[PDB]
Each structure stands twice: as structure tokens, then as C-alpha cells.
Amino acid sequence: REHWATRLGLILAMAGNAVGLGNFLRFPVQAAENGGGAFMIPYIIAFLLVGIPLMWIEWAMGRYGGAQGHGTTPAIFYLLWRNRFAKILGVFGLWIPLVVAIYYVYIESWTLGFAIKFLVGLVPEPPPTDPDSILRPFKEFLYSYIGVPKGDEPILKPSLFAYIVFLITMFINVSILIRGISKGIERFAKIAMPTLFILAVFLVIRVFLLETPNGTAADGLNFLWTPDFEKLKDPGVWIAAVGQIFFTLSLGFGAIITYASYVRKDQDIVLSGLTAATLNEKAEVILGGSISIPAAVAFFGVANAVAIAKAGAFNLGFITLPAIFSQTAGGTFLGFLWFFLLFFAGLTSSIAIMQPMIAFLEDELKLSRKHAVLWTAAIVFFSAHLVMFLNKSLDEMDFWAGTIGVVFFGLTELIIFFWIFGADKAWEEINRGGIIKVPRIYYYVMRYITPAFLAVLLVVWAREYIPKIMEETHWTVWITRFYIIGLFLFLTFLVFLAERRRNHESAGT
Amino acid sequence: REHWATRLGLILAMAGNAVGLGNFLRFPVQAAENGGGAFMIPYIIAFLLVGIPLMWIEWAMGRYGGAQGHGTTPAIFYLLWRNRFAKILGVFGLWIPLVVAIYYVYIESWTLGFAIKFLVGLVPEPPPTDPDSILRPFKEFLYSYIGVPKGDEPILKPSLFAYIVFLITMFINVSILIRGISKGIERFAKIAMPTLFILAVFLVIRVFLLETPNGTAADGLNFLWTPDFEKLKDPGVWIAAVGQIFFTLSLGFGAIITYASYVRKDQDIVLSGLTAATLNEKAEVILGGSISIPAAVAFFGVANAVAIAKAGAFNLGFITLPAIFSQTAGGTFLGFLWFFLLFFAGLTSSIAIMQPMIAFLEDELKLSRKHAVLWTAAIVFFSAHLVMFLNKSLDEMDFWAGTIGVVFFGLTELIIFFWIFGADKAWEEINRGGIIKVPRIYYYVMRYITPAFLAVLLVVWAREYIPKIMEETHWTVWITRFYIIGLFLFLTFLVFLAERRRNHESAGT
């Protein structure tokens, strides 16, 4: 089995897995919608009670499974729990990352397309003037790129440029993945992560210099880091915070598991795990948080910024920020650096999200790396046409796989590892080979606190928030639901084909 | 490998394959739309120049492949032409019947649901009066069953009864298929075909007794069998006639091939093939043709009947005929006999349409019969939700797979067998074991006349008829196109997995 060549390469690859569009696009929107500093206390508590323990748990499960030649959850779940139901539940660790891949790579392709056009100066020219005279050209720029519906049909019409750039993005992901773990992912991570950090720091510095009659970058920081204790009682803030923690640390996607399955059987995961997670948190709260919000607040004031963030998920990063930059000397190039940053943030993450599918085809169906990568790319590419051409399909996939799915899977994987497989056996598996040991308190966190936290969360979620979406949606959501249910059935069938293959091999020996 | 137990069982099973909804529902509509007797000369010529030769060709290819343990076209095409492209082209012999299955079984389920309600007298009561006061209750009856859209959203809402009956229909197909070739399909065919013939003859007799001030059943017959020679110059009539010939004889669906792969290597196919095809033609022109049209013409006159047929594909058999029957003594029960007839016609055909997928999973992926049947049923059932809930999805599948697809595949399979593999070698393969030999003239038909006929047909088709559908459709057609393209990719992947399995088995020996 392939292994990570160096410890640094391991850490940077795992940091690249976690550090992504979630740090720079999702986090600021989530924090801004939920009162800035009011979002941060639940967020921090979620990092400690959920983020950290699940990270160690997923590293352990992957390392454990990798030692036996298995990097994905259909097989790994079965190793921890010898029941046919474990294989079925394991299918989610293939389904979640595949479905997320289908929209994540497409959004990643936009950052590349924007980087290209911003570099060559093929951007909108605002009148040299109210905010809307500045923002509108950039709104139309995004709208023409992804092809937002101009009528009442729920159909998107991406530009030819956007489509070709998606193909190129897919090509770039394949070029890295096809070279494997050490010579592809690990090697790229060593080049990508320092670069990414450099760009982000520069952007933070450049944004900290923003100043207008409406305020400064410092105002944006104070809004993000000023605690509001009268919001700790709102369930909505906790749900948003835990969902961000999952999304940001790549947890519940079966993808930390798969990466960890290339860690050598006795190699450390306690310090490595903690370090990869802390690296992500710094890139998130210090870098991601210091760019978008402070810039928006400096130009529009706190109240307007919050309204912008609420407007959409992509408004702040694809419209507002580049519009703001356009009013600053060298702002088009700064727009380029921002989109180039997002692209490397996306790319280092999308190779991670597609690897579980690759690992499954290699490990369980005995495909070569070449074939596993190409077939995986083929499924993601073909499937992405749904997200490219059907308005709101992206939203539906992100809800079922990237939002609900990950929390459910987080709880599932913990129960299987710490309850079914055995708490003391799990505790010993995590700690084996550790450069440091997991603090004793975290045994009781993992066994009792974390599962109860997630279970209560999911209950409050399904009671007071999901019935508002099962009745209040356009019929076209069923196209996406139909298709991704079909993907789950497809993956179940492959797991079935893999158990049959394993049986025929065992018979002929 | 499984084989047909008896020659009679073989013939009746192959007759059941061919004799179906196409004989009783499709043929009358096609003939009525295309001028009755004006349709019949092209139809007869198509039977002789296309129907017969392709039938012998498909029996031969299946018997040939079966001798080597292969019943489907990905492998069989490769045996006749040792090129990677033959496997890819072979995928259509899995894709066409699977896509057709997805809508054919659902329509079959309607005949069962109607049979049930007509038996128990849970039918509409017309006022005891213009034609529309009689027809409307039956139109609403069909519309409430399949759930035709009442607004402007392209969404169907099938009754709970229709849905459960679909599940039962799937269950009934599985119960037969899971018992295999001789103990399932062949056994059922021996029971189903005489029954079906009996019902049809009775219905023909009962319809021949229909008489109203508007005309008699004899008027309907004269319209169907009175030649119009000024229509032999219209390409549209020839296209309709050849498409019906394909659909009716089950040709181009990879399904005659698969059935024939259970015929013993030296067993006759010339007489058996001709007999199965003549049996279908009798059930079509004599039985199918003598029920719907003569009844419609007897009650409404020739001109009104033609208009009814043009109204839709299901109008004549699901609305008009039962409405007409309702005006006759014992007419509700006669409605039941009609729908019971359609159901057995559908059932004997849908077990045939799903067998290529079963044969592929057995032959190439080494699945047991149980698993192959259950997984096949699972894909058809899941996939049928598209046809059940999206208005016009059925139409789109029937065009690409059941209409264009079969003619393309007919031409493809002939070129591969009679041109690539070798005309003299093909001619000898067909004739080997024959109780009679194929008339010498048919060598030149198969080699020269048939492929040129189909090629010209496809050209005239794609030039003057398909651009009117690539521009003139609602955007929702892309949902279906997207999904069935995804099915083709899925099947290509399985063919890929099968070649990999074959290679690993050959290495370990």
C-alpha cells in the first residue's frame, strides 16, 4: 500500500484537505449571519467537543483500516463491526464525498475562471456613484459566468468559458491524483500550502489597510470577536457552528479516514491530527476571518455587511470583495490574488474529496490507480452537469451530503468506533504510536459528551428546521434527490460487487 | 448454461417475447395514423426485407454466443469482431432493453390495475347522450390513475393504487425470472400464450358483433386492408412501418439475442425463428388489428377513429375501447378481458426485456440468478420513478431507446455479423442445424438489401424529422436524457469491470 513519504508532507496534505473554500468563503458568511462574535463561542466549544475528538477518531479509523489494506468506510466499518449493516452504513463514506465533489469542484472551477479573467483584466468597469453602481457590474459578471436564470425556468446557462474551465479544473485534479499519494497529493501539498499561506497573509495585510468614511478593517474584526452572550441560547447558532466545524475540518466525509489509511500502522496520529486541525483553525479564524468581513465592513459598515452575507453564499466572495477591490489601486490584481488563493484552497481540498472513491476502487475492486482516477473523474464530471444546468441543485446536494450527511456520519462513525468496537480498544488504537497522548478527559468526551452533543443537535435540527424544507421547495429538488439516491444505490451495488469478488478470491485459495 | 427444455417451450417463449403491448396497443395506432391500408404495404415489405432477416440474424448471434457462455452483445459483438469498439457498441444491447424496461413495465402495470378495477366493477358510470359524455368519465379515470398534470408543472401524481400495482407487477416479473429460463420463462409461456390467444380470439369475435348507426366492425377491417398506393411515396409511412416491425418483432433490443443464447449449439433456429415471427405477425395483424380499430370505427365512423388514434398512444386502448364496451351488455367484464389480455401480453414481454440485464450479470459478472434478477429489478424499479413522476419522460425514453435506438442497433448488429464477421461465415452459422434452410435469395437480402434499407431510412429520418425534436421540446427532456446517458455510462463501467474480472481469472490460471 502507498504511504505518505514524510511527516511534513502528511501534515501539509492533511492541512490542504481541511483548509479550503470553507475557510475563505463559508466561514465568513456563517459568522456574519450569526452575529459575528455571537457565532464564535459556540464555534470554539464545537471545535473542542466535536472538532478535535472526531479528528482523532477519523485518523485512528483510517490508520487502522489502512494497515489491513482498506481506506474507505464500507470495509472499515465492517472491520470494527462485523455486520452486514456496517457495510451499508459505510456506503455513506463514499456517497457523501462523491456528492460533495460534484458541486465542490464546479465552484472551484469558478475561482480559476475568475483568477484568469482578473489576471488579464477582462473584468467589469464600474462608473468612476452609489454602491449599486459599483456592485451591479460584478453581480452581472458572476451571473453571466454561471448563467443565472433570466426568466422563470429553473435552468442555468453557463458561459462557454465557465464550461471549458470546469474541464480544465477536472484535468488539473486528475493530473495530481493520477500520480498517487506521495508523488501527487503529498508533493503538491508541499508546494500549495506555503503559497496559499503567503497569499492569504498578504491579503490580510492589504485588507487591514482598507479605510473609508464608512469605517476601517478594525471595525470588522471587533464585530467578529466581540462576544454576545444572549445568543448562546439560540439553537440556530449552535447548529450553524457545528456544521461549520464539520465542513471546515473535513469531518464526516470519509475523507480524513481515507488520507489516514496511508499513514503507517505505528506512525503518530495524535500530534499529527491535532496539528492539521490547528493549522486549519488558524487559516480559518485568523486568515479567512480577516479578509472578507473587515473589507466589507470597512466599505459598507457592520449592518450592511451582515446583510450582504445573508444575501447569498457566493455574493460576498464573488461579487462584494472584487467590487470593493476595484475601488483600490491595483485592485484588479488583488482580485486575482484572492481568486488564485481560493483556487489553491479548493484544489488541495478537491483532491482529498475524490480520493475516497479512488481508494475504494483500488482497495476493494482492484482497479489500478490510473483507472480508479479516470473513472472517478468521469462520474464527477458527468454528474456535475446536473449542478451546472439545474438551478439550486448545488444547494440540494450541499444540504443532504455536506450538511445533514456529515453530522449523521460523524455520530455514526463515533458510535461504531467508541461504542460497538469498544471504547477502551478505540482509546488504545488512537493513542498507539502517539508522540503525545490524548488527555484523559477526552476519553469521557469521546464516549459520552460528543455523541450526546451530536444526537441532541440532530434532534433539534430534525424537529424545528427540516419540516420547513420538506414542504417549502420547488418540485425540481426531486430531480437532485432522485439522482443522488441513485448514486447511493450505485455505490451500494459496487460494495456488493466487491464482497462477491472477495468471496471468489477466497474460494480459489 | 441453462437451456430451453422443449422446442414448444422455446417457440412459445419467443412468441411471448414478441407478442405484446405492441400488437394490441401500438400497431392499431400506427396503422390508423398512417391511412390503414396505406400503412400495410410498407409494413409487409418491411417484414420481408427487415423483420425476417434480422430475426434469423439475432437468433444466430445469440445461439453462437450462448455456446461460448455469452448471451448479451458486449461480449457477443467482441466474439464476432475482436475490437474494443465492439464491446462499446455492444453496450447498446444492454442499454436499449433496460431503458425500455423502465417504461414498459410501468405501462404493463396499468393494464393490471385496470384489469383489477374492471373486474370488481370499480369503473366510471357514463350518463344513460353525446360521445364526450361517455368518453370523459373514462378519460378522467385514466388521468386520475397515472396522475396527469392539472396545472402547468410537468409533474405526474400517480394514485396510491397505481403505485402499489406497479410494485406488484415488479413482484410478478421477479417471481417468473428468478425461477430461470426453463422453470420460469418457458413454463410461464406455455401457460400464458394459449390463454392470451384465447382471450384475443374471443375479443375479436365479440368486437365483430359490434353495430351502431355509425357503422360495423367490417367497416374498420376494410379501412385497414384497403391499399392506398398514393402513400407509398411518403417517407413518413415507411419510417412508421419499419419502426413498428422492429418494435413488434422485438428486434434491435438485444433481447431476441439473449433468449437465443439458451438455444443448444446445434438446435434449429431457421424454422424456430420464422415460426416465432409468423406467430407474432398473426397476433398483430389478425388479432391486434381486428379489436381496437373495428370497434372504434363501428361506433364513431372511419374519420373519427383515425382522429382518436392520432390523439395519443394510450387514448384508444385505455379510454376509447373501454368507453365503447361500457355501452354494451357485459361491457365492464369485456373491459376486464381486454386489460387482462394486455397484461399477459405485457408480462410475457417484460420478462424478455429484463433478461439481457440478468444474462449479463450472470454471464459476465458471475452473479447468481437470484442476485442478478433482484439487482435488475431494483434498477428498473428505482429508475421507473422518473417515468412515473415526470410528465413526458416515458416519451423521451421510448424515442431514444425504443425507436431510434433499435433501428441503429439493427443496422449495427447486421454490419458486425454479415460484414465484419463475414457474410459466408454468418450465412453458415444461421443455417447450421436448420430444419429448413434459408432461401438463397435472403443471402443477398441480408448482405446488401437490408443494410441499405436501414441506412437510407436512418438518413431520411435524421435529416427531415429529428431536427424538429432537438429544438422543439420543453427543457425537462434533458432530465431524462441526462439520466439515460448516465445509465449508458453505468453499463459501460460494468462492461469494464467484467473485462477486468475476466483478466484476473485468466492470470490466476
Ligand SMILES: CCCCCCCCO[C@@H]1O[C@H](CO)[C@@H](O)[C@H](O)[C@H]1O
Ligand atoms: C445530457 C448530459 C450531456 C449533454 C451535453 C451537454 C454538454 C454541454 O453543452 C455545452 O454547454 C456549454 C455551457 O453551457 C455551452 O457553451 C456549449 O455551447 C454546449 O455545447
Ligand SMILES: CCCCCCCCO[C@@H]1O[C@H](CO)[C@@H](O)[C@H](O)[C@H]1O
Ligand atoms: C483558459 C482559456 C479558456 C479558453 C476559453 C475561451 C472561450 C471563450 O468563448 C468565446 O470568447 C470570445 C472572445 O472573443 C467571444 O467572442 C465568444 O462569444 C465566446 O464564445
Ligand SMILES: CCCCCCCCO[C@@H]1O[C@H](CO)[C@@H](O)[C@H](O)[C@H]1O
Ligand atoms: C442535467 C443537465 C444535463 C445537461 C443538459 C444541458 C445541455 C443542453 O445542451 C445545450 O446547452 C447549451 C447551454 O444551455 C446550449 O448550447 C443549448 O441551449 C443546448 O442545446
Ligand SMILES: CCCCCCCCO[C@@H]1O[C@H](CO)[C@@H](O)[C@H](O)[C@H]1O
Ligand atoms: C474538552 C476540553 C478538554 C481540553 C483540556 C485538555 C487540557 C489537558 O489537561 C491536562 O491533561 C493532562 C493529561 O491528561 C493532565 O495531567 C492534567 O492534569 C490536565 O490538566
Ligand SMILES: CCCCCCCCO[C@@H]1O[C@H](CO)[C@@H](O)[C@H](O)[C@H]1O
Ligand atoms: C423529477 C420528477 C419530479 C417529481 C416531483 C413530485 C413532487 C412535487 O411535490 C413538491 O414536493 C416538494 C418537496 O417536498 C414540496 O416542497 C412541494 O410542496 C411540492 O410541490
Ligand SMILES: CCCCCCCCO[C@@H]1O[C@H](CO)[C@@H](O)[C@H](O)[C@H]1O
Ligand atoms: C426520489 C426517489 C424516491 C422518493 C420516494 C418516492 C416514493 C413514492 O411516494 C409515494 O408515491 C405514491 C404515488 O404517487 C403516493 O400515493 C404515496 O403517498 C407516496 O408515498
Ligand SMILES: CCCCCCCCO[C@@H]1O[C@H](CO)[C@@H](O)[C@H](O)[C@H]1O
Ligand atoms: C391489489 C390491491 C391493491 C391495494 C391498493 C389499495 C389502495 C387504495 O388507496 C385507497 O383506497 C381507498 C378506497 O376506500 C380510498 O378511500 C383512499 O383514498 C385510497 O388512498
Ligand SMILES: CCCCCCCCO[C@@H]1O[C@H](CO)[C@@H](O)[C@H](O)[C@H]1O
Ligand atoms: C424522478 C422522480 C422521483 C420521485 C419523487 C416524487 C416523490 C414525491 O414524494 C411524494 O410524492 C407523492 C405523490 O406526488 C405525494 O405523497 C407527495 O406530494 C410527495 O411528498
Ligand SMILES: CCCCCCCCO[C@@H]1O[C@H](CO)[C@@H](O)[C@H](O)[C@H]1O
Ligand atoms: C425478400 C423476399 C424473398 C422471399 C421469397 C422466398 C421464397 C423462396 O423462393 C424459393 O427458394 C428456393 C430455395 O432457395 C428455390 O429453390 C426456389 O427456386 C425459390 O423460388
Ligand SMILES: CCCCCCCCO[C@@H]1O[C@H](CO)[C@@H](O)[C@H](O)[C@H]1O
Ligand atoms: C436538468 C437540467 C436541464 C437543463 C436544460 C438546459 C437546456 C434547455 O434548452 C432547451 O433545450 C430543448 C431541447 O433541445 C429545446 O427544445 C428548447 O429550445 C430549450 O428550451
Ligand SMILES: N[C@@H](Cc1ccc(F)cc1)C(=O)O
Ligand atoms: N474542509 C474543506 C471541505 C472539504 C475538503 C475535503 C473533504 F474531503 C471534505 C470537505 C473546506 O473547508 O473547504
Ligand SMILES: N[C@@H](Cc1ccc(F)cc1)C(=O)O
Ligand atoms: N415486441 C414487444 C416489445 C418488446 C418485447 C420484448 C423485448 F425484449 C423488446 C421489445 C411488443 O410488441 O410489445
Ligand code: NA
Ligand atoms: Na477548512
Ligand code: NA
Ligand atoms: Na484545500
Ligand code: NA
Ligand atoms: Na409484438
Ligand code: NA
Ligand atoms: Na408478450
